[PDB]
Each structure stands twice: as C-alpha cells, then as structure tokens.
Amino acid sequence: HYGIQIRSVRPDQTSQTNVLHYLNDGQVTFRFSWRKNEYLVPVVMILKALCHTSDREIFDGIIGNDVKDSFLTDRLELLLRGFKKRYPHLQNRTQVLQYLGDKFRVVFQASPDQSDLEVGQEVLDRIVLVHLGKDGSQDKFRMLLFMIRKLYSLVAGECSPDNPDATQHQEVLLGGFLYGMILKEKIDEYLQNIIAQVRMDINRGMAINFKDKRYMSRVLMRVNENIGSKMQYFLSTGNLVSQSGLDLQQVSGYTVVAEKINFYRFISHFRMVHRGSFFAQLKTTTVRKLLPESWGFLCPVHTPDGSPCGLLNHFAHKCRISTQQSDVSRIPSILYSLGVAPASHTFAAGPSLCCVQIDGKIIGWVSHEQGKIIADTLRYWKVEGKTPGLPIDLEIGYVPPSTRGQYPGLYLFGGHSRMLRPVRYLPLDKEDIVGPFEQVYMNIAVTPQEIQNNVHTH
Amino acid sequence: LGIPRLREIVMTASAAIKTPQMTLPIWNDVSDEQADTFCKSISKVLLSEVIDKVIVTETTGARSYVIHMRFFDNNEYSEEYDVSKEELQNVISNQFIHLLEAAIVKEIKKQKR
Amino acid sequence: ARTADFRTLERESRFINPPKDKSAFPLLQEAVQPHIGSFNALTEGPDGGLLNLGVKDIGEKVIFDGKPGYLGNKLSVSVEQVSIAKPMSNDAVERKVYPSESRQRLTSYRGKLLLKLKWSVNNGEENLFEVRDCGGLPVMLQSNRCHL
Amino acid sequence: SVVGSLIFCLDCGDLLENPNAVLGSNVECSQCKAIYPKSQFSNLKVVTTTADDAFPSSLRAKKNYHTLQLRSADEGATVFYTCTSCGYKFRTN
Amino acid sequence: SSKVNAITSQVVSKCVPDGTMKKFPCNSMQAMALSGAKGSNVNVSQIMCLLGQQALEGRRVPVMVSGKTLPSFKPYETDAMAGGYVKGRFYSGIKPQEYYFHCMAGREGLIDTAVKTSRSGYLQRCLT
Amino acid sequence: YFDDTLNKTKIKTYHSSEPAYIEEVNLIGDESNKFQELQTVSIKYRIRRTPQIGDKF
Amino acid sequence: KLELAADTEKLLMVNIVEEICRKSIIRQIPHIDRCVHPEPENGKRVLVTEGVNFQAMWDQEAFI
Amino acid sequence: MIVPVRCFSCGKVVGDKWESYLNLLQEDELDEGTALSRLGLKRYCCRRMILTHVDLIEKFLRYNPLEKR
RNA sequence: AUCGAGAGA
DNA sequence: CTACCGATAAGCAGATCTCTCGATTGCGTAT
C-alpha cells in the first residue's frame, strides 16, 4: 500500500502524474497514464533510459554514505537483480530506449518515420517528470533517485505518509489554467482531425498533393473547426469532453452558474474552492474535517451545511493565489553562496542531509543545521527587499529532521497556483508572504500582546 | 453500537459479527487474583509477543541463514503471559520452524516463475 | 475618536459621480484577482502566454502518402501562434460588442480565435501557412480580452 | 567493488552476477566481458534486524527579542529586539 | 480531557447560581434552564462561565505533523488551551484560537447530524 | 402573432399563478447580415413580494 | 542455522520471518482472542472474552 | 434607495428631512447625532431612519435609457 | 425524458 | 484407483423527505 505520487506540471500548466508503487518482493514499479489507460514500467528501465548510467551509479545515488543500511542494500540488490533477470538484454540506454519505443508505438500514434530510439526519447520527454521538461534528463535522473530513496524511507518507517487531504500538500486549479489546458487539448484534437482527414483522402482517393494550396484548402473545409463552439459547450454544461483525459478525477460539473441573488452570494462565488464531486458520493469523513493547516488560507466558518459541508470551503479574504511564475533563475546562484554543495558532483543521499529543491528540481545537498540557517537567511533577505534574486512571494518550505515524522529537506517553491497570505515578519517589522507548506513549521502569533521571546518569528 | 449493531443483529443476522464476545460468570469462591490469572491463561498469546528482536545473518559463502531469535527476560514474559521456557521451545521446534520452512519454499517456488 | 463611522457624505458624492481615476475599494478586485490573473496569463506574460506554450509543446503530427526507405512526402501540420481577439461584430468595419449587449441579446460574449496552421511538407521543402477562424471563444469579463 | 551482497566491476561499474550462480573461477561482466576469479569473495555476510515495530506486544510497550542565525554557524547569532512601550527596534550582534 | 473537565465542573458548580448577578426566578436564563422550557445547565454554563474542552471525534483538536496544533502554539505545547480547552464564554467572547477550535467542533457536529438524519432509514423499511 | 401556416392570429399566455406587471419589452434582432422580421422579443415581469406570514427573516 | 540451495535467488528473510512470528501461536484456545476481567458492575463479577466458543469454556468449571 | 417618507416604528414623517440632513452635515460641521437632534428626531426609532439611509437612487439614476449618453 | 449544479426541514 | 463431498480463494448482485434551475449524438454522403 506504500507509494510515491508526484503531480508534475508542464510549463504550459498541464499536469502529468507519475507514481512509484512498491512491491513486497523488493521491486519498484513506475506507473503513468497516457490516454485513459494505465501503464506500468519498471523503475530501473526508465532510470537507465533517462541517461547513460551504470548500476553502480544507481546504487550510489539511491544510497548515500549509509552503505550499512541492510534494508536499503537488500531492496536495491533485489531491484537491480530483478531488472537484470527479467530483461537480460538492454545493456545500454540506446537499447532501453529502443525497447521502450517498441513497447509504445500504437498507443502514442507514432509516425512510421519515427525511429524506435526517438519514440523512446519521446515517451521519456512526455511521461517521466514532465516539469523538468526536455533537455533535463540528468535532473529527472536525480529526482527519480530522490523519489526511490524517499519510498524506501517510507517503507522503512522513517517517514510519515504525507496527507493528501491536508492543505499543507494542496494547491488550487485557478479555472483559467483549466481553460488554457482545454484549449490546448482541443487544438491538438483539431490537428489530429485534419491528419485523419488526409488519411481518409489517402485511403479513398489517390488524388493527393501535399504541396497544393487548393488541396490544403479543400481538405481543411472537410474538418471541424468550431473550437469556440466546443469551449461554449464546456462552459454551458460543465462536462469535460476529452479524448485523452486530463489529470483530474471528475468529468462533469466544472462550471457553476454565478447566481445574482445578492452581492454577498456573487462575491462568494469567486472565493470558493471545491474538493471535487468525488467526495460528495462517499462515506469516509476525514476529508471534511477542519484542519489546522487551513489557518489563514481557508475560512473556518464559511462552509455550507448539508451534503457539501467540509468540501465547498472558501478562502480567507487575504488569501492570495499566485498566477505568475516568480523570477527563480538566480536563486540557485544565491544558494551556492550560502553553502549548498552543487548537485552535480556531490554524491549524497539519505534523509540525513537537506535536499535543497527548487520547484521540483534538485539544486544541491547540505546538512540539516545549515539548511535551517539557509532557510532563515532566505526569509530574512526575502522580507528585506534588497537582494534582487529573491521575490517576496518565494515559499521557503523548509522541513526539519524529526523522529519518524515528515521527510526532511529544504523545498523552495515558486510558480502558479500557490496559496499565499500576508503575515508580519517580526524582525525589521515588514510584511511577509507564507504558504501552507512552510506555515506548519513556523510560529505565527495571533496578537502582538502574546509574542514569546525566542519563539515566534511572525 | 447503534446502527452498525442493529444492522448486524436485525438487518442481516451475520454469523460472524465484528466483536464476538461471551460473558463468563465466576464462582464466589474465586478471588480476583485467581480470576485475573485465569484470564491470562485463557487469552491467546502469539509468538511475536515474546520476541525482542530477530537477527538474520545471511551468508552465501549454499545460501544460508542464521536466524537468531531474541526474547524478553524469562521473569518478564513468563509473568506477563504465563509462558515458560519449555512451552517456548516446544512451539519454536514444532510450529514456528515448520511455518518458516513452508514460507521459504513457497517464496522459492514463486521466484522461479 | 469613533470606533466606526457612517461615511454618508463621501458615499453620496461617490454615488452621484463615480470616480474617473480608479475604482475605490481596491480590496473588491483583489478578491477576483485569481480568476482574472488566470485568464490573463493564457494570452500574455513571458514566452508569449500559456496558449503559445501549449501549441509549442503539442508539436507536429505527420502523415505520409505512400507514393514512390521511402514512404512518400510527409505532411507535418503544426501550430505556433494562437491569438485571441477582443469580441467584435460585423454590422464594413467591425465595431466593439459589450457585455451589456451580450446580456441583452441573451447570447454569449465570445471573441474570435485565430490559429495559424503550418502546412509543412517534406521536412521544410515548402510551408503553406494559413490563419483561420475557429469559432467564438468565450472570454471572461474584465480580462485583457474584454473591452472593460 | 563489493559492498554487502553486491559486487560491481572496477571499471564498468556494473553489478556482477551472483558468484555461486556462475561457473567456477570465472564470472563475466555483462558489459566489460572481464574476468574476476572467485577468490577474495569468501564471506558475503549481510546482517539484518527486525523492524523494531513489527511485533506490537504488551511487553514491548512496558519497555520582545528573537535570536536568529543568519549567514553561517561561524558568525554569531543576531538578536532582533523590539521594545513594546515605545516601538523602537534594534538588533544586537 | 478528564482533568480539564474536572476543572470545568469545579468552575460551573462554584459560579452557578451563587455567583450570578440576577437570580432565579428573575433571571430568565436560569428560569428557562431549570424550568425545562428551553436550554439546559450546559448552555447556561457555556454562556456564563466557560466553554470547556472541545472534543473532536472523541478526542481533542487535531495536531499537525510538526507537533503544533495551530500556528500560534509552539510545537508540543503542553497547555490546555493549545489542545482545545476554551476558557471563554459566549458572554465575554473567545480568542481567535478558541474560535478556530470551536469551529472545528461545530463543523463535526453539523456533519454528524447530517449523517444521522438518514443513517437509519433502511432499517425501518427492512423491518416493516 | 399571425401564423401563415394557420391563417389565424394566435396569442401566447402568461403561464404563472402569481400576477405581475410588465417591466420592459426588449426587441432583439438577429445578428445575420440580412434584415429579417422581428422574431425574438424579451418580456420582463415585476412581482410585488410584500412580506407576508410564512416567509423567513 | 538455516541453509538453502545456491541456485536460489535472494530472499528477504526478515519480512517472511516477521509474518511467521505473527502467525505462530504459543498458547491459544480456538476462537478466543483475549479474556479480560472488567470491573464488577451490577454486583456480579463477570469476564468477557473476544470470540465465542461455548464448548471450550465448559471445561473450566472450576472458575466459571 | 429613496428616503422613507414615514418612520417604520412610530410613523413620524422623516421623508422631508434627508436633504436638510445632508445640508446640515455638509455646510455646518455637525456630526450625525447633533444633526438628527436639530432636525427634530428624538426617538432612536426616528433617528435610525435618517442616520442609516443609503440613498441608492442616486446610483440607480445614472442608467437613463431615455437620454443620449 | 435523462444528468449536472444548488436550495428547504 | 477413482468418485463424491467439503472448503477456502475468487467472482457477482444490491438500497443507503420536499423544491428550483441548466443542459440535450458525431460523422458521412451522394449528389
């Protein structure tokens, strides 16, 4: 029942989920879904397709200096040996990519010109860790090693199950990003429609010419181009008619009618965030509970009574949602100045070092005390708007080392859909912006009368 | 309690209920100490409830295992569960080793496929 | 002092003559900031916007003709630019249509969606570009694709 | 080259086959095609231990100023005082 | 919860009705409570003495993975107020943290009533 | 409206138990470039909701 | 000490051992999970056992 | 919307006092209490009618369909 | 007629 | 030495007070 789920999102704000199930026999499987169909793949196959890597590199990546962890060593031996025994061939990344391309040809509608090697590169670029994007295979390799370490820590009992229904591990789909995703999907289907139309031309009538403007204009007139009408249908019905399916659960009820009974109703229409229609038809009631993680982000009071109680909650009136990607390029340069060892030539692992990670991309490794110091310094320089590399909206989601608690590490976040609230930074007395991920570890007094010395920072 | 129990009783008449219990009246000549001792000697005790830790020293120098079993102190687990050295040795020799062999061979047959 | 106060005079003045510089109550618009920002980000911002990024990520899907190793001439259709126009009407030179008109007509308030298709053949031997109307794309009020 | 129960080749960095599953005095790397004599591989002793939490038993159970560190550990902590009577604020290093 | 409920009982038994300003039968609040017209001594005590421990799913308030039950309280705060003990009355008002905890409890109560209004609907028809 | 398929004038009817007053009548013309007849008209009603016994406050 | 053929692959030998230690019983009477001695309510002194097996308790007449 | 002609609770005509109330607030620096007192509104039932009137008809009047805008 | 959103006790 | 009857792992059928509003098949084809 263990696993690791990451919801990677492309730069055009499209989502792709990659899970890492654990098998009791010692092998980890990689699960994704291209169309409305689930596909399973051994984790070492993708780990070898990502880059030219040996088996000693995988071992030294998933295991750091703790070669004496018999749990880790036995799990890794079983995993590597099982891959080598199930697929005795595929000794090189080229062979692994070719095998992946052979595995996925009809599912991806790959063209006959597409070689198997480049089809494997295509599935690699469109499935595993899409947020790293193309030309980020080394980063995807490091992130997969990190996720395997974290899964082994989870099954070893050294980590706690991150709560999916806690606001600490949630964001909000803004509803304009959903519009953009559906537009991208519809124009993709439009391209597929014109390709299928020329396919029917080929199969029926030999009169074709891919250089004829008359032929182009004649075949385009035989396809459907009412993307606007399809968008109007989506807005009118709420149904998400998708041939591929988004990374979402429900298929209907995405658009509500903004009622105008009074201005209070109208304004609250634009402040409500829903859990989903999935949880309305259910019996488990742990998802409706009011949790401390919603302090300052979700309203404790404003929630309807009856069926939608606990699911149709509203934001605090000072809860800001980031719709723009923050300038993050020079933050890695700042981090290396603070003491973060670069993630290219460090060779460290395990939950005994702080994994400094920016927007789902590993930046480096550093001790826990130094990670705490770095988080404090980033907060100080973020509130004090002198350093040009640190936007005020940066969410410094530090997680300290505990005993069987959460997985430690420094998790800097930027980008869209984040939940942000203004809170007064007590040193130098200036406004600060915090998110749900970092809030649950920082002390935030509710009134200046009750600040405790060396306790509260905000 | 409540609706789940009313369901178990009058809605489906389940032969296997969630919490099967039976009440045992006691003789008035049995002290509470004797009643508690009887409760301990009647309640079940698994083998895992006297185990401190298990160390498996696997050596392939033909693939062996040296399964050292560590128990609590005798004057502790005998007092807690009324289980002695003789009964512990008997269960280990008869049922534990047999189940271990069965699990090992089943896993071996599974790994062939 | 006074803990609270009716702002009778300024309320009456602002009712009689609305502001010409900016809307009072800035907090009333920071509430709908998420939706407006989400819709604005798909047609503006760095790298051209979310729609341009999406059509870049989609790429091209190709087909062959089978005419005489050699499967024939390729047809790599793709999109590289998506533009949204503020809603207009043709009732000539196009005028501006307002959401008041949309509500009164009991019809939608939709702009015009234009995609330039890239009818590439044989890996860039010749490219037949063409923009094309794709129906009416509904737009959200007070967004950069609205006249308000 | 050898850690616990896994043996890696000194050059290729590949996980060698199980020593007792191959022919005598010869184990072949799947990529190096190199030769490792079965000597110096006497004891592959891997010692484990139970989960320390897999046996839940009753016996198991019975057994205003704010100091801050900014740059590094070497530099001293900075205390950010704030008087409550007047609102004057200063930091001490 | 047992200890803080003992303290709550001490407070209410000490301060009602001896400490009240307007007394029965003039005090209409106590008149309604004792007479059985509306309310109860529990409601009177919550209005006039304190709200007491907030019980959630048979437990106190939930605690995040960091040991903090709320951002205001330091990790592993051994204090009754941190765990949900509201030393506040509806006559004088409750602090923001106690307001948050009381909202937790009220939401749980609303959920339970919504479930219980029809959790027992199939049994009657199956019998009848 | 007069129907040519019937050669007889047919009326519609206020289908509501609650009486109302005509607030405004909007003449909507189709956006097509041709200039057709009047085909869509919007009629608004005003209902006096004097507070009576039974409604909630 | 336990021994096996060299041809066999690697086994966890901790997970299976833990499962077996959970499974194997030292002293149990069929269907009885736990017998406890609650405080005597209504005056009578009663014991409650988890699991019903009437014919197994008929033999302990000296205490029941 | 438009000033109520009569006070709800008692029935004293307060509809002829809205403009004079605004004048007393504007020209003289009289606060609401003193202005209401000078207007002759003694009972708080009468005072609330003019103290809390919103006069939304001014905002309603800018949408004139009979005038070129 | 069907499925989606919501509302009252 | 094989037929017949149990006996647990797997598969398969099924319910859990009133009232508004909004929306409603995709292509294809032979003239």
Ligand SMILES: [Zn+2]
């Ligand atoms: Zn090698």
Ligand SMILES: [Zn+2]
């Ligand atoms: Zn009056």
